[PDB]
Design a protein around this motif. Structure first.
Motif, PDB file in Angstrom:
ATOM      1  N   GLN A  20     -10.188 -35.591  36.309  1.00 37.97           N
ATOM      2  CA  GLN A  20      -9.688 -36.795  36.922  1.00 37.97           C
ATOM      3  C   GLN A  20      -9.662 -37.970  35.803  1.00 37.97           C
ATOM      4  O   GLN A  20      -8.956 -39.115  36.343  1.00 37.97           O
ATOM      5  CB  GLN A  20     -10.555 -37.192  38.124  1.00 37.97           C
TER       6      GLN A  20
ATOM      7  N   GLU C  35     -24.292 -34.626  60.463  1.00 36.46           N
ATOM      8  CA  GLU C  35     -24.666 -36.053  60.639  1.00 36.46           C
ATOM      9  C   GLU C  35     -24.249 -37.139  59.049  1.00 36.46           C
ATOM     10  O   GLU C  35     -24.011 -38.207  59.256  1.00 36.46           O
ATOM     11  CB  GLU C  35     -26.107 -36.278  60.385  1.00 36.46           C
ATOM     12  N   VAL C  36     -24.434 -36.302  58.027  1.00 39.37           N
ATOM     13  CA  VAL C  36     -24.008 -37.024  56.851  1.00 39.37           C
ATOM     14  C   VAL C  36     -22.453 -37.376  56.752  1.00 39.37           C
ATOM     15  O   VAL C  36     -21.936 -38.515  56.243  1.00 39.37           O
ATOM     16  CB  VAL C  36     -24.235 -36.332  55.495  1.00 39.37           C
ATOM     17  N   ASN C  39     -21.616 -41.079  58.552  1.00 34.90           N
ATOM     18  CA  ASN C  39     -22.068 -42.113  57.621  1.00 34.90           C
ATOM     19  C   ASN C  39     -20.852 -42.978  57.475  1.00 34.90           C
ATOM     20  O   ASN C  39     -19.638 -42.574  56.935  1.00 34.90           O
ATOM     21  CB  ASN C  39     -22.754 -41.818  56.590  1.00 34.90           C
ATOM     22  N   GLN C  41     -20.539 -45.079  54.874  1.00 35.88           N
ATOM     23  CA  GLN C  41     -19.992 -45.071  53.612  1.00 35.88           C
ATOM     24  C   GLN C  41     -19.434 -43.778  53.181  1.00 35.88           C
ATOM     25  O   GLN C  41     -18.774 -43.658  52.071  1.00 35.88           O
ATOM     26  CB  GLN C  41     -21.172 -45.443  52.652  1.00 35.88           C
ATOM     27  N   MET C  42     -19.952 -42.641  53.592  1.00 33.27           N
ATOM     28  CA  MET C  42     -19.474 -41.310  53.259  1.00 33.27           C
ATOM     29  C   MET C  42     -18.029 -41.224  53.991  1.00 33.27           C
ATOM     30  O   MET C  42     -17.108 -40.570  53.545  1.00 33.27           O
ATOM     31  CB  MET C  42     -20.371 -40.301  53.779  1.00 33.27           C
ATOM     32  N   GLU C  44     -15.698 -43.163  54.525  1.00 26.76           N
ATOM     33  CA  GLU C  44     -14.774 -43.843  53.428  1.00 26.76           C
ATOM     34  C   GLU C  44     -14.554 -42.704  52.325  1.00 26.76           C
ATOM     35  O   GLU C  44     -13.456 -42.656  52.002  1.00 26.76           O
ATOM     36  CB  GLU C  44     -15.275 -45.007  52.848  1.00 26.76           C
ATOM     37  N   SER C  47     -12.273 -39.483  52.943  1.00 27.91           N
ATOM     38  CA  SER C  47     -10.907 -39.700  53.034  1.00 27.91           C
ATOM     39  C   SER C  47     -10.226 -40.174  51.865  1.00 27.91           C
ATOM     40  O   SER C  47      -8.912 -40.119  51.783  1.00 27.91           O
ATOM     41  CB  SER C  47     -10.727 -40.957  53.942  1.00 27.91           C
ATOM     42  N   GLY C  48     -10.946 -40.457  50.756  1.00 20.66           N
ATOM     43  CA  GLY C  48     -10.315 -40.544  49.219  1.00 20.66           C
ATOM     44  C   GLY C  48      -9.928 -39.219  48.728  1.00 20.66           C
ATOM     45  O   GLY C  48     -10.196 -38.235  49.206  1.00 20.66           O
ATOM     46  N   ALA C  49      -8.739 -39.462  47.949  1.00 22.03           N
ATOM     47  CA  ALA C  49      -8.253 -38.410  47.112  1.00 22.03           C
ATOM     48  C   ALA C  49      -8.858 -37.846  45.845  1.00 22.03           C
ATOM     49  O   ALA C  49      -8.502 -37.812  44.861  1.00 22.03           O
ATOM     50  CB  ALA C  49      -6.793 -38.696  46.813  1.00 22.03           C
ATOM     51  N   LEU C  50     -10.069 -37.850  45.930  1.00 27.18           N
ATOM     52  CA  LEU C  50     -10.956 -37.175  44.714  1.00 27.18           C
ATOM     53  C   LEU C  50     -10.581 -35.846  44.648  1.00 27.18           C
ATOM     54  O   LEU C  50     -10.559 -35.121  45.527  1.00 27.18           O
ATOM     55  CB  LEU C  50     -12.226 -37.587  44.856  1.00 27.18           C
ATOM     56  N   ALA C  61     -25.341 -33.775  46.031  1.00 26.48           N
ATOM     57  CA  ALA C  61     -26.519 -34.544  45.684  1.00 26.48           C
ATOM     58  C   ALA C  61     -26.805 -35.366  46.968  1.00 26.48           C
ATOM     59  O   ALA C  61     -28.214 -35.390  47.135  1.00 26.48           O
ATOM     60  CB  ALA C  61     -25.830 -35.512  44.575  1.00 26.48           C
ATOM     61  N   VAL C  62     -25.949 -35.662  47.491  1.00 29.12           N
ATOM     62  CA  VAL C  62     -26.607 -36.387  48.950  1.00 29.12           C
ATOM     63  C   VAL C  62     -27.039 -35.252  49.858  1.00 29.12           C
ATOM     64  O   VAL C  62     -27.973 -35.776  50.469  1.00 29.12           O
ATOM     65  CB  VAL C  62     -25.371 -37.409  49.548  1.00 29.12           C
TER      66      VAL C  62
ATOM     67  N   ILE D  11     -30.205 -39.655  56.168  1.00 27.60           N
ATOM     68  CA  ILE D  11     -28.833 -39.634  55.392  1.00 27.60           C
ATOM     69  C   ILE D  11     -28.567 -41.023  54.430  1.00 27.60           C
ATOM     70  O   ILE D  11     -27.985 -40.861  53.712  1.00 27.60           O
ATOM     71  CB  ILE D  11     -27.741 -39.135  56.480  1.00 27.60           C
ATOM     72  N   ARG D  14     -30.561 -41.216  51.351  1.00 28.55           N
ATOM     73  CA  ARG D  14     -29.972 -40.420  50.276  1.00 28.55           C
ATOM     74  C   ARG D  14     -28.577 -40.720  49.844  1.00 28.55           C
ATOM     75  O   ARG D  14     -28.207 -40.693  48.651  1.00 28.55           O
ATOM     76  CB  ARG D  14     -30.208 -38.937  50.501  1.00 28.55           C
ATOM     77  N   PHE D  18     -27.802 -41.922  45.986  1.00 33.97           N
ATOM     78  CA  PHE D  18     -26.888 -41.058  45.055  1.00 33.97           C
ATOM     79  C   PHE D  18     -25.606 -42.082  44.869  1.00 33.97           C
ATOM     80  O   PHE D  18     -24.599 -41.532  44.119  1.00 33.97           O
ATOM     81  CB  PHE D  18     -26.717 -39.792  45.316  1.00 33.97           C
ATOM     82  N   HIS D  41      -5.599 -45.837  47.981  1.00 30.95           N
ATOM     83  CA  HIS D  41      -6.886 -45.509  49.069  1.00 30.95           C
ATOM     84  C   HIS D  41      -7.501 -46.716  49.053  1.00 30.95           C
ATOM     85  O   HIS D  41      -8.044 -47.360  48.198  1.00 30.95           O
ATOM     86  CB  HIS D  41      -7.621 -44.351  48.665  1.00 30.95           C
TER      87      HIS D  41
END
Ligand SMILES: Nc1ncnc2c1ncn2[C@@H]1O[C@H](COP(=O)(O)OP(=O)(O)OP(=O)(O)O)[C@@H](O)[C@H]1O
Ligand SMILES: Nc1ncnc2c1ncn2[C@@H]1O[C@H](COP(=O)(O)OP(=O)(O)OP(=O)(O)O)[C@@H](O)[C@H]1O
Ligand SMILES: Nc1ncnc2c1ncn2[C@@H]1O[C@H](COP(=O)(O)OP(=O)(O)O)[C@@H](O)[C@H]1O
Ligand SMILES: [Mg+2]
Ligand SMILES: [Mg+2]
Ligand SMILES: [Mg+2]
Lengths: 345, 342, 173, 86, 230
Positions: A20, C35-36, C39, C41-42, C44, C47-50, C61-62, D11, D14, D18, D41
């Motif tokens: 990327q 559940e993660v 969240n 912040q997750m 969001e 939905s990103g194109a990573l 990691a999370v 959740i 963590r 990270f 985005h």
């Protein structure tokens, strides 16, 4: 090192993934080893994370998923200048006349912006073809564009050859010939005509023939135009002969279908007018030098009304529309005086 | 929202071990069978355009390489195949028997004898898909190809290495004109090839009978892809005939190839495309239908003597070779405006 | 809505969990994964194109207190196909598959009056006649029935409400 | 064994550890580039018809506001842009 | 197989004046009657049945594919009241039946005709309407998950037609003679289904509404009807 991998191969379209961080730019060029042969790819789109959709500049056969791909960090660049005179080259600027290396001193990129509005020039010096109907109904200036509009078998190639004889010999300057989707037999005929005329040493030739993959034919014209622009920026007056503009648009259509572009009217690409404009605007005469252009355009079915002939009409200074009907009656040249004109008249 | 051949036992295998072992990249499994198209899971090393071997003695051509799938078209009777069959990729592109001994024979598009006169006595194999001679390897056409019809030979000359379209509606004499042109080469030194795409078998039997009444059959190769054979065989049939014509061209001899109903090839490539779910175009034809006929017809060439010496490694000196093409196209009530005719 | 794409992952994960018998542990692992996904912040990030690898490893990691070999590898497969939002539905279908395998069912009992324990007892026995599965009764109180009891075994419904009897009679006339 | 509130707090902990942060509502990143059209985005507060600012003193227009991206059109030479630009 | 095929020049006279002079049909070959709705391609076939049965001695098969039930009922009672029924085998798949029946009924009739061929006999095979067979495939095609082709047709149309047409043929052990009615939609003789049907026939008789409207029956167009035997 090579930093990308092929993930799909569908016809002329090759999908490549990179980390990327190092994603190549649009119109960048990539290189992969297909069996024993080096294959060049050109980047068309950046889609998702790390993937670029690319067009192959050679035969797709033999490509595997998972082949390594290297990002050459620049567009396709071709040899330009005095070292190209008398030589035949392909889309990549490689020599196909079997006379050895080009021996160039400079290489230019085939993608570039058009001259600025401030840089354009206006002059109306008339030029004489020696052909009655053309000199009468469609007189040429110097530095303008000349369109020869016709369907199959109406005299575009014969008129272009006679015009080459009459204009080029008197020109006393360099010229460029671009064969876009041209028959190989006719390319050989033209090459042997030029060497028998002993004028070959003032003409540079670029050929992308009908059998070649869509990528080659698509970018051949830009190669020839880049050579013409090199001669223009040296300050010279040059002739650019393009043997058919239609198959530029048609290669674009074949490519567009598989690029995932949504189809448009009459099956054409959405970008047809944009692609045509990006090509034609580069072909002008500036305050530093002049390109004079003669272009053949195939009109399908003599329709003259479908989007590709329609869009190309706007760009040209001189228009000569050969008609099947006049030719069929046996009269040459087949120019229709009721649809042909020049803005020099 | 749709699935993509992610299915239960495959997912369970990946759950047990995500970085599944290298095993062999050479082989895979059929996951779907329909209308002569199969989807294969695996085959990490399959090249685009490569032959895939199937149970029995059958093959498929890998046309779509996608993200963990290969789409392949079956070159024969497909309905016997089944999900879960193993398949192995060869190293091979499609090749066909070629040589002088093919003269007087009737063969299918894989070059298997179909006339029942016994096995072939070919001269090795040649690739079905090949690149045409370049611009510097041509020579201008100047020798004639004598058709024998006053109107054609006077007003519409055909030379060695020319590509002359024969075009008209149904039942207009296209087949008859072409085959009479073959018969006129009975004593001309030009070898003839007749490739029939999508025609009914008894018509081919009838034209072979007329070719046998006259002396022309002993000078021609007939390549047949009947209407019952799979679309892959019809689509590949013209290229095999071209690969047989190029044998004589590359060795300093003259050949005349009569592609019959190149339109009935275009329908075949369309069937393959729409079954492979590629984006459709005008009259629903694939976008790359121009490239098909363009890279077939550009093989018809006259090649200079230096190319013939370079190819034959000096065995034949000072003779130009030639391949002359006579494609046949059918018009819907004469409208040249149609996509394939244009 | 991911109801149709969740089935393959639910089924495959359940079969693997059964082979190694830690079905309850697998359900915990999936609950944590669901559940993660909710969240702020997750949701969001998802939905990103990573690229799938980077996105997955951030999620991994999370996602501490999962099994590297099996659970986190299910995460890898779902990341490849871009379906991590299917986790809140894969969880429900995994629980459904477990209920089917354990021959145990959950049903709702609804009435305007809070039901007496003897009523619930006889209901459970009768339902276990109708249903091969054992039944866990859920008590819901709603004045809508006005009287009687509404039996709701999911899609299978037996209506025993006066209001239902009344609005059924109204259309007879 | 843990409850829903417990799992929710763990959740969030963590996720904080990270460093999977969210975008600011007026900012975003390009995720696709093709034919003069770019996909972005983020930009949760962008409005339709608004001007989106690109690097190099170039402009774009917010035309296709979608659930997970903003489809915008470049008002100039587009070929410089790349997936990952703010 | 191509090795098993056979050819014959024997003219098989049919009473109708126009068909024999303009488009002679030989024994063991294929004949196709092309026409729009209500132009006489069923009635012409009944005249052919009458006239051909004069000089033919062997068995015959009739395939009713996606046509009116009444035509078949009337046919059956004409056959039984003239005691010729003892020599004809009938398969019916008429137009009220669901798509699968109408699709596979044609193949069944070919199976029977091929048995009587393979016993070494000569057989007459009449197909009530071959157009319906392609149309049933159209009706099913989109539900099978296939992208449409040309004017909404199935992408495999040419192969579906060819795979059926190539087995209704003569061999060195016996011969099948066949008459096929070919409906053309909206009187459009350029439509892909009629267009691909033309190539599979020896004698093609083209009926036209303009001639029927003038009272002229049988309404054959002499400027389009043709035969391989002329
Ligand atoms: N010169 C000729 N004189 C007389 N009849 C001819 C002549 N040339 C062809 N024909 C006849 O034309 C008819 C059609 O022939 P042919 O099959 O070659 O046509 P076509 O246009 O190629 O048809 P299709 O595409 O249906 O196969 C035949 O009956 C043939 O005998
Ligand atoms: N020789 C004839 N003389 C007079 N009328 C005729 C003749 N042949 C056919 N017709 C007319 O055609 C009508 C329909 O005949 P037929 O069933 O053969 O037509 P068709 O085109 O096959 O129709 P469809 O597809 O609806 O069955 C007859 O009822 C009659 O009016
Ligand atoms: N001035 C001319 N004199 C004689 N023949 C001509 C002339 N112009 C065109 N033709 C005829 O047109 C055909 C070749 O034209 P060409 O220009 O090669 O086709 P196109 O216009 O499709 O490029 C030949 O039949 C040639 O005789
Ligand atoms: Mg030309
Ligand atoms: Mg013919
Ligand atoms: Mg009828």
């Amino acid at each position: 090192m090579a930093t990308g991998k092929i993930v799909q191969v569908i016809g002329a379209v090759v999908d490549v993934e990179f980390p990327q961080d190092a994603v190549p730019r649009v119109y960048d060029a990539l290189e992969v080893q297909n069996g024993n042969e080096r294959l060049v790819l050109e980047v068309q789109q950046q889609l998702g994370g790390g993937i670029v959709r690319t067009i192959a500049m050679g035969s797709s056969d033999g490509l595997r998923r998972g082949l390594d791909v290297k990002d050459l960090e620049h567009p396709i660049e071709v040899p330009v200048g005095k070292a190209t005179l008398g030589r035949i080259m392909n889309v990549l600027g490689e020599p196909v006349d079997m006379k050895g290396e080009i021996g160039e001193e400079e290489r230019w990129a085939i993608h570039r912006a058009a001259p600025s509005y401030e840089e354009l020039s206006n002059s109306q010096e008339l030029l004489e073809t020696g052909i009655k109907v053309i000199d009468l109904m469609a007189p040429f200036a110097k530095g303008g564009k000349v369109g020869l509009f016709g369907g199959a078998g109406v005299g575009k190639t014969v008129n272009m050859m006679e015009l080459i004889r009459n204009i080029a010999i008197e020109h006393s300057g360099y010229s460029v010939f671009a064969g876009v989707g041209e028959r190989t037999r006719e390319g050989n005929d033209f090459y042997h005509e030029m060497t028998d005329s002993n004028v070959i040493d003032k003409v540079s030739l670029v050929y992308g023939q009908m059998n070649e993959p869509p990528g080659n034919r698509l970018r051949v014209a830009l190669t020839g135009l880049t050579m013409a622009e090199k001669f223009r920026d040296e300050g010279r007056d040059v002739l650019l002969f393009v043997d058919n503009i239609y198959r530029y648009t048609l290669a674009g259509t074949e490519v567009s279908a598989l690029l995932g572009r949504m189809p448009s009217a009459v099956g054409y690409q959405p970008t047809l007018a944009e692609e045509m404009g990006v090509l034609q605007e580069r072909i002008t005469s500036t305050k530093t030098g002049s390109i004079t252009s003669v272009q053949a355009v195939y009109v399908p079915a003599d329709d003259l009304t479908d989007p590709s002939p329609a869009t190309t009409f706007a760009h040209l200074d001189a228009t000569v529309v050969l008609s099947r009907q006049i030719a069929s009656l046996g009269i040459y040249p087949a120019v229709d005086p009721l649809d042909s004109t020049s803005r020099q008249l | 929202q749709l699935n993509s051949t992610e299915i239960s036992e495959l997912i369970k295998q990946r759950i047990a071990q995500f970085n599944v072992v290298s095993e062999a990249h050479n082989e895979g499994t059929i996951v779907s069978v329909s209308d002569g198209v199969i989807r294969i899971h695996g085959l990490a090393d399959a090249m685009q355009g490569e032959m895939i071997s199937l149970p029995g003695n059958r093959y498929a051509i890998a046309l779509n390489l996608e993200r963990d799938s290969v789409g392949a078209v079956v070159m024969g009777p497909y309905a016997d195949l089944a999900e879960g069959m193993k398949v192995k990729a060869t190293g091979r592109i499609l090749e066909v028997p070629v040589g002088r001994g093919l003269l007087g024979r009737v063969v299918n598009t894989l070059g298997a004898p179909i006339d029942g006169k016994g096995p072939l006595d070919h001269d090795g194999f040649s690739a079905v898909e090949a690149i045409a001679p370049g611009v510097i390897e041509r020579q201008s056409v100047d020798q004639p190809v004598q058709t024998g019809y006053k109107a054609v030979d006077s007003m519409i000359p055909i030379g060695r290495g020319q590509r002359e379209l024969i075009i008209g509606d149904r039942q207009t004499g296209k087949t008859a004109l072409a085959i009479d042109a073959i018969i006129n080469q009975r004593d001309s030194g030009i070898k003839a090839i007749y490739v029939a795409i999508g025609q009914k078998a008894s018509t081919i039997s009838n034209v072979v009978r007329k070719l046998e009444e006259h002396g022309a059959l002993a000078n021609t190769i007939v390549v047949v892809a009947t209407a019952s054979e799979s679309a892959a065989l019809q689509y590949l049939a013209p290229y095999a005939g071209a690969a047989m014509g190029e044998y004589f061209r590359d060795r300093g001899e003259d050949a005349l190839i009569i592609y019959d109903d190149l339109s009935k090839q275009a329908v075949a490539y369309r069937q393959i495309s729409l079954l492979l779910r590629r984006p459709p175009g005008r009259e629903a034809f694939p976008g790359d239908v121009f490239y098909l006929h363009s890279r077939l017809l550009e093989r018809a060439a006259r090649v200079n003597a230096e190319y013939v010496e370079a190819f034959t490694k000096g065995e034949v000196k000072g003779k130009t070779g030639s391949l002359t093409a006579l494609p046949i196209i059918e018009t819907q009530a004469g409208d040249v405006s149609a996509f394939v005719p244009t | 809505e991911f109801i149709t794409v969740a089935r393959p992952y639910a089924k495959a994960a359940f079969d693997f969990a059964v082979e190694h018998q830690s079905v309850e542990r697998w359900q915990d692992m999936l609950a944590f994964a669901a559940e993660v996904t909710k969240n702020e912040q997750m949701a969001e990030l998802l939905s990103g194109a990573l690229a799938p690898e980077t996105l997955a490893e951030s999620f991994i990691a999370v996602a501490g207190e999962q099994l590297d070999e099996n659970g986190q590898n299910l995460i890898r497969v779902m990341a490849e196909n871009g379906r991590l939002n299917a986790l809140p539905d894969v969880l429900e279908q995994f629980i459904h598959l477990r209920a089917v395998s354990e021959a145990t069912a959950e049903v709702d009992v609804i009435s305007a009056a809070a039901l007496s324990e003897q009523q619930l007892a006889k209901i459970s026995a009768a339902m276990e006649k109708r249903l091969s599965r054992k039944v866990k009764l859920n008590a819901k109180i709603d004045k809508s029935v006005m009287a009687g009891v509404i039996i709701r075994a999911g899609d299978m419904v037996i209506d025993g409400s006066v209001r239902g009897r009344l609005e059924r009679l109204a259309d007879v006339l």
